[PDB]
Amino acid sequence: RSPLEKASVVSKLFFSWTRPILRKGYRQRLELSDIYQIPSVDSADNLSEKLEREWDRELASKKNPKLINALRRCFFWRFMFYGIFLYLGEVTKAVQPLLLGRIIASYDPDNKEERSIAIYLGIGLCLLFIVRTLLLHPAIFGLHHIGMQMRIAMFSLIYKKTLKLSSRVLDKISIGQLVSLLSNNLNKFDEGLALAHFVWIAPLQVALLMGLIWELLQASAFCGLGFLIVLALFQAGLGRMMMKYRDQRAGKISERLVITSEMIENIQSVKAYCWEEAMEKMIENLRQTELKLTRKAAYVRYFNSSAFFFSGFFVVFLSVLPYALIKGIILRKIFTTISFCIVLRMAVTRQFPWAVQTWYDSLGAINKIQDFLQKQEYKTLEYNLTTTEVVMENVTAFWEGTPVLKDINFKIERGQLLAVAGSTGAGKTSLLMVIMGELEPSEGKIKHSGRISFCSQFSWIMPGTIKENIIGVSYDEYRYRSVIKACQLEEDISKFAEKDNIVLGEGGITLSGGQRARISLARAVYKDADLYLLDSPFGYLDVLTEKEIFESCVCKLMANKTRILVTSKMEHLKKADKILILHEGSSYFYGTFSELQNLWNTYLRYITVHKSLIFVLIWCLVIFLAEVAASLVVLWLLGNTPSYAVIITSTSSYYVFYIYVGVADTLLAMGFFRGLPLVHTLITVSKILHHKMLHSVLQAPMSTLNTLKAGGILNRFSKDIAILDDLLPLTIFDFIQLLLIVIGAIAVVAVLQPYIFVATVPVIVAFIMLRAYFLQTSQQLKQLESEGRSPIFTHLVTSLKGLWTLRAFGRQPYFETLFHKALNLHTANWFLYLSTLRWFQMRIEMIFVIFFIAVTFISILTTGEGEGRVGIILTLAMNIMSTLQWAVNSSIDVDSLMRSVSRVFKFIDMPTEGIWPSGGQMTVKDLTAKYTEGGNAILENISFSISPGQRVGLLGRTGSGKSTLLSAFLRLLNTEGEIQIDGVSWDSITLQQWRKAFGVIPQKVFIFSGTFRKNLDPYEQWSDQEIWKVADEVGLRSVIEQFPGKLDFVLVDGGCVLSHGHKQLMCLARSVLSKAKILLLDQPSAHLDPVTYQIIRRTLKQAFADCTVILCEHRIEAMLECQQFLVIEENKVRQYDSIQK
Ligand SMILES: Cc1nn(C)cc1S(=O)(=O)NC(=O)c1ccc(-n2ccc(OCC(C)(C)C(F)(F)F)n2)nc1N1C[C@@H](C)CC1(C)C
Ligand SMILES: Nc1ncnc2c1ncn2[C@@H]1O[C@H](COP(=O)(O)OP(=O)(O)OP(=O)(O)O)[C@@H](O)[C@H]1O
Ligand SMILES: Nc1ncnc2c1ncn2[C@@H]1O[C@H](COP(=O)(O)OP(=O)(O)OP(=O)(O)O)[C@@H](O)[C@H]1O
Ligand SMILES: CC(C)CCC[C@@H](C)[C@H]1CC[C@H]2[C@@H]3CC=C4C[C@@H](O)CC[C@]4(C)[C@H]3CC[C@]12C
Ligand SMILES: [Mg+2]
Ligand SMILES: [Mg+2]
């Protein structure tokens, strides 16, 4: 099936099997209908199985486990098999000046030997071109193919280890680091392997060339060699400098990215707090520090790169001078030694340093992967046969100076229900950890059963269909329909737009809090297990639905299976068989309930965004014309000037033009007065574009941001911005340098002889018409290839949030299969892109060769009795086109990189956003709310009024629009209608003033990784003594003094150290500093303890005594301080009065 394997030998050599896609993609848009199936050789299954079979031996049979050893047991003898052909193709390039140099000398009538035999040289030279064409490109493509296999084999091997990481390893560092570990060699590995052989080929080339140069310059060859040794040492020193600055700034990039992710995820809170300006400055300082090291690395890379161009004269003159002074040198050997040194400079100044740097990076990546592969593993050994009767006795455990649980025991017969209770932080969840084997007890003795179904408190939602999130692997209509219509999903499912096949994102951002709880609960009960562990599923569910689910699912469906339920509700305990209460990590009570009572134009915009890049580009052009003007006059002065060191004859004067073209690269090289300004100015363009994009995202309508993918926002700040910092500044410089040399060399030799320009027209046009044909298909495949990587990273992310559920039930093989399917999709697009690019770069050389054979035979045949003007003109023209072929291939990379610039620009063009509070009486009239444009209408024609200072209760069934109303107050979503506060209409004042009057307290409090004082007020409006004054009422004094630093402690990881109640207090104090008037609470009482619960009770009655509060609760017992009640149901709001109803 795979066209590569079905291809014949002759077609496979020329890459002819890429013909169908090039024609198909030239006249229409491509899709996943003609993307060819991947070859069987590089499927993820075959590569991973082979490599792991060699690696596991290396860590068990040999003394020292090294990944590099196992890698060479799989890919070494195929690596060397392509190295010999790569070497033989380079040797062919070194011996060309012998055949070509004699042909050029054959135009001189003063020669006899070359005239006698030129046809034989022409035939041999033609064969030399054909052999080299068909010897390099297959070898380079082979090395790319092996580099792809290494990348796939290691990524699949990494994922398998990730599924086995111990629980204690995950809690230190993961997810954010793990994804970054895979994004450093996504394309640098395969493409950065074809030049690893030049570490030994280049020394073999220098020895060969130095022997050939010894024939010309008897003993002065070494004088030029010593200059190249110094250049090699000089370039090597820059390598240590580049790596030092690269690895020194690695920690700054991670610091920016992790903070940027926090801002993106909680963007809805950032808008509500009116914190747009503060966050822009916070990132701005981080960019300013990073940019200092970025420029240093770019200056070092400039001097390392600009050594090939600035050595084309100092290596020739230094070796020709001693010989010319001792004895008179003729022009023919001056051109010949120039031709040899062109290859000599490329090998030692451009190929060898690149090869060495690659080995530093290839070995560094393998050692980084090697260390990760040997972390502590999750223990899979567990009891198999126990008759499904879990028992514990004298069990102790630690999460590290205090035991988490001590001497806890129970005994559950099959079909019983155990109710676990306690307080916040008592270890309810940690008790379930030991039962799954996630936390091996230090000195305990516990019995494990078979498959165990775990329902974590954290809601897990994975990409795909709603039913696909429930059924798992096997489907069953009768079972599915019963589970769906037992968890009260009947109504909500057949509501949205598409019944049940709705496609969800990672984490289910578009779903209600309680709807996600039911889906996670429904998945746990669907699958058959020996025992079920329900870790507090009723957190988000209101009382009315809580009873219905408890009576129809927990007590009805699984009435005859052992089940452990964690719950604090008093009524749920009496319906259980045995109860276990944890006081503080220790069993205070154990027993039954009965005994409990007693106890294009993109390029134009990229350049002019700075308005300073214009002047630098003009400066480079003006100097370029000055050097060209000098080159013209000096060649014209030598054109009429009348034995010296240089023996020049009338019949051999044409060598002047050949010599100039051979050294034109040096004469037109950009020095440090032009290169450094250009590199500096291109970098600050990236800084400018980042600022506009970061400014645009924080000031965009929420509806626009919801239409995009989950992780897509961060990907532009992670990949696209990073490309503008490293790849574009140097790739553009290299492209401009090559193009400028070609224009300069072709404009000076053509004015004296107005025929070279004409003879070189066909070559230029052929390279251009081929480029326009290939780019149509190449760009389309690149877009498909780049988009194919997001599903791969999403699978890795979602398989970590639900990792504890995976290992409990034993579904690792299923997720390994899913990960392999994601890789094969990315491999299919990448392989086709790599093959068509090889097709283009092979045909571009084949067009050059066919013109060379045409020129060579004409030049030899046209040469008559003397001279021959056609031979001189044509042969010189083809020497100019050698650089153009290089320049055309360099332009492909620039076009590929400008796709990233276009993606940056479209984010900037997003649309923008659209004592005054006397009493706080708002009036709502005809309010319609919708999350997305044209999706639905959650609330329709809402009308109600609030008395100033009243406490308004808010109730309703989960998934009705309870939280949509609170967001519509801030118009954080597309709304129509009029909401007036004390007579001031919804659109009489700017949006900034409107949002400042609301003290919203979300379910997830936004706390970024920064100083304690910075979180309270990023704008730095209030002094210490004013902050302490506010903390006196909210009870934050003792909370903050626990830490070593007062107002100076550095919170990390979302404030992980702070408990849920402590973050509620911090959010409450934040609204007091800004002096809010209308509060918006949203289900704070999920798992709160009375220690902090009573603090909010006082503050809403002491500081906000006269301020309106919208208490959003799920039970009437807590709502004993409200007068007015709002009830949401069937897209309607209806106000009420005192409890008598
Ligand atoms: C058709 C077709 N369309 N597509 C998309 C693929 C195919 S193809 O693969 O069938 N053929 C071509 O791709 C193809 C094959 C060979 C050549 N050659 C040009 C000089 C040359 O040298 C011959 C010589 C004997 C000297 C030696 F070989 F030694 F160099 N050969 N040119 C080819 N092309 C036809 C156009 C599509 C583009 C272009 C000009 C590059
Ligand atoms: N992964 C972990 N690493 C370190 N300490 C942990 C970890 N998980 C829990 N702990 C600690 O163990 C103790 C008990 O954890 P916790 O989940 O287990 O109890 P809980 O009663 O279930 O809490 P809650 O009802 O609020 O979820 C606490 O001191 C907590 O900080
Ligand atoms: N970001 C969103 N984009 C689109 N639709 C959404 C989004 N968030 C919620 N919805 C939809 O709005 C409806 C109600 O959402 P939800 O916040 O509003 O109800 P709720 O009563 O506040 O939830 P709960 O009581 O469980 O916390 C549901 O149909 C849900 O799918
Ligand atoms: C092993 C690899 C690197 C190839 C071989 C390298 C050495 C042995 C080769 C490369 C070029 C060769 C030289 C090329 C030209 C001449 C001039 C001739 O009048 C005497 C031999 C002499 C001086 C050759 C001696 C051997 C030589 C120096
Ligand atoms: Mg818990
Ligand atoms: Mg809600």
Author numbering: 3 to 402, 437 to 507, 509 to 636, 846 to 888, 902 to 1173, 1203 to 1429
From the reporting publication:
CFTR belongs to the ATP-binding cassette (ABC) transporter family but functions as an ATP-gated anion channel. It contains an N-terminal interfacial structure called the lasso motif, two transmembrane domains (TMDs) that form an anion conduction pathway, two cytoplasmic nucleotide-binding domains (NBDs) that bind and hydrolyze ATP, and a unique regulatory (R) domain that must be phosphorylated to open the channel. The predominant mutation causing cystic fibrosis, the deletion of phenylalanine 508 (Δ508) in the cystic fibrosis transmembrane conductance regulator (CFTR), leads to severe defects in CFTR biogenesis and function. The structure of wild type (WT) CFTR shows that F508 resides on the surface of NBD1, where it makes extensive interactions with the cytosolic region of TM helix 11 and intracellular loop 4 (8, 17).
In contrast, the type III corrector elexacaftor (VX-445) stabilized NBD1, resulting in a cryo-EM reconstruction of 3.7 Å resolution with ordered NBDs. The TMDs of elexacaftor-bound Δ508 CFTR closely resemble those of full-length CFTR in the phosphorylated, ATP-bound conformation, but the NBDs are very different. Elexacaftor-bound Δ508 has a “cracked-open” NBD dimer in which the catalysis-incompetent (degenerate) site is solvent accessible, and ATP makes contacts exclusively with the NBD1 face of the composite site. Elexacaftor partially, when used alone, and fully, when combined with a type I corrector, rectified interdomain assembly defects in Δ508 CFTR. In contrast, the binding site for elexacaftor (VX-445) has not previously been observed. The binding pocket is much shallower than that of type I correctors, as if the drug molecule is patched onto the surface of CFTR. The dual-function modulator elexacaftor (VX-445) engages TM helices 10-11 and the lasso motif, all of which are important for CFTR folding and function. Although the details of how elexacaftor potentiates CFTR await incisive electrophysiology measurements, our structural observations indicate that elexacaftor stabilizes TM 10-11, thereby strengthens the TMD/NBD1 interface, which is particularly vulnerable to disease-causing mutations.
